[PDB]
């Protein structure tokens, strides 16, 4: 027989459709709405990414149908046939749906009926194919059945299209509604209305036990709210099916897999279709590119059993009920708590996968006799076991979940006769550098070494890398910092590039950039709530900074994600203001001095902020360093700094410094540096001196050569 897949059926639990092997359907998408069918070659690549399914946005609907000259359904048939044929012979599943195009959150009822009058009987016999009635027919979620739904009548469209499909394809799985925003216990309650209205029409009774149907939903409420809505709906007896979602790594400023929601959907037993495309083309991000899928799975510790290939690797958490270890928690609106991760509870999975050890035997013999890591009993406070026989090159991964991002005290309980080296990365990103661990003088003589780290939010593998041997490891600890990165107080914010401040506007509760006028609207109380996170409130009325559909100010207190801001030091006296939600940094746009925005980390001055006492002197701006013709001379010029008596010109040979002060008492906004060596790069900054008080250094100026 052919490798064509057997018809999906609801699982015993009644949570989703699973394939002919009892496993969830997991896949990316492709479109044939205004483009050719993706080639066999590229659709095949799906199987190497642990996918067994493809989402097809088949055609997009015309609002004007069936007026003269409007595009009818059927126009893409020759390409949709190719996708059906190609997924058939690749042993993949296929979810076919009607796309929206430019008309998002909308549908045409008659276009959809005639779409399924055509396509339903055409693929009825195709066991690997499922029908999802329509992508996001309403703006933007339940209840569709409300008269004030935008637009109304979607439930009637679903009812009509289900009846059309069952006539022409009685065995074929149907995915309903495709709620764009499906969030909260509210979301589930509102969907139940639409589900009950649907069931009363089709089956005659508000509560029907579906044998071959499920609620399709998307992830645009966010992972927390979507998970709550799915849990609730599953409890009411209705299988679900994720058909479109996205997230990305915290701090990337880009899309890709929502790792957090995938983990929750894996736990609840829910099949999913992520919104990354099969090459060559698509409207979002390419699923074959590491940054948008494979690396995100690889960095997080996420695992499932793939239908084809050997990725992802089989792995999991040891202890803690097989669930990623939480790092901190909110207790009286302050981020606190110490999580102890025992070193001998490294993830299971294998040698080369969840740990690397130099041999396959546990020479110590304790705790985990079937694995390669070397474990003995320890005589340290709290008893238990320690990882010993640590050779250089070895490593141990522990899957954790940093629900609250920011600054954490990372602690290693260590013993060793002599010193040793280690390095810790989180999500395959170095957070420590080379960490010199002290000599204790014995192999059960214990001490705690501690180092401060900046963790991003989400599932992430903590990985101890042993750069030297000769130490034993008992446990690891993370707790959020109890003392902040900057003292509590009232401050003025000045952007490093342009010297501008942030100002409250009570009339529309907005925050906008302006020149530091010295007023209370441009003054801000700062209060640390654990983890380097801060509540930032205006001085005049006690209203808190809020990053949500713009950048404004609100009455409710700051423990929710939009009202919380990580103040992250640069190292050179400035800070960047990281947003707790996505990990992007608050910056003024180099391009438009008025526009405030959130972008991913870069070296530029426009992303950096001075958080200063109100009376502190302003730093210089606009520094520009240019080489003079035919000679060793750098001509510096900058803008005059308010209240400056003089300037100090400083120079370094790499970006960021340190900066050796080449000249002081400059009573002018320009300088000529004669001591520049032939054909070498130089980096300049300038500070001002106001009433004996030296300011911060300006933004860096790279020495500019000729064309
Ligand atoms: Ca071993
Ligand atoms: Ca070992
Ligand atoms: Ca231990």
Residue numbers in the entry: 36 to 742
What do the study's own words say?
To explore further the role of the non-catalytic modules in CtXyl5A the crystal structure of CtXyl5A extending from CtGH5 to CtCBM62 was sought. Using this construct (CtXyl5A-D) the crystal structure of the arabinoxylanase was determined by molecular replacement to a resolution of 2.64 Å with Rwork and Rfree at 23.7% and 27.8%, respectively. The structure comprises a continuous polypeptide extending from Ala36 to Trp742 displaying four modules GH5-CBM6-CBM13-Fn3. Although there was some electron density for CtCBM62, it was not sufficient to confidently build the module. We postulate that the reason for the poor electron density is due to the CtCBM62 being mobile compared with the rest of the protein. In the structure of CtXyl5A-D, the four modules form a three-leaf clover-like structure. CtCBM13 acts as the central domain, which interacts with CtGH5, CtCBM6, and CtFn3 via 2, 5, and 4 hydrogen bonds, respectively, burying a surface area of ∼450, 350, and 500 Å2, respectively, to form a compact heterotetramer. The interactions between CtGH5 and the two CBMs, which are mediated by the tip of the loop between β-7 and α-7 (loop 7) of CtGH5, not only stabilize the trimodular clover-like structure but also make a contribution to catalytic function. Central to the interactions between the three modules is Trp285, which is intercalated between the two CBMs. Thus, any perturbation of the loop (through the removal of CtCBM13) is likely to influence the electrostatic and apolar environment of the catalytic apparatus, which could explain the reduction in activity associated with the deletion of CtCBM13.
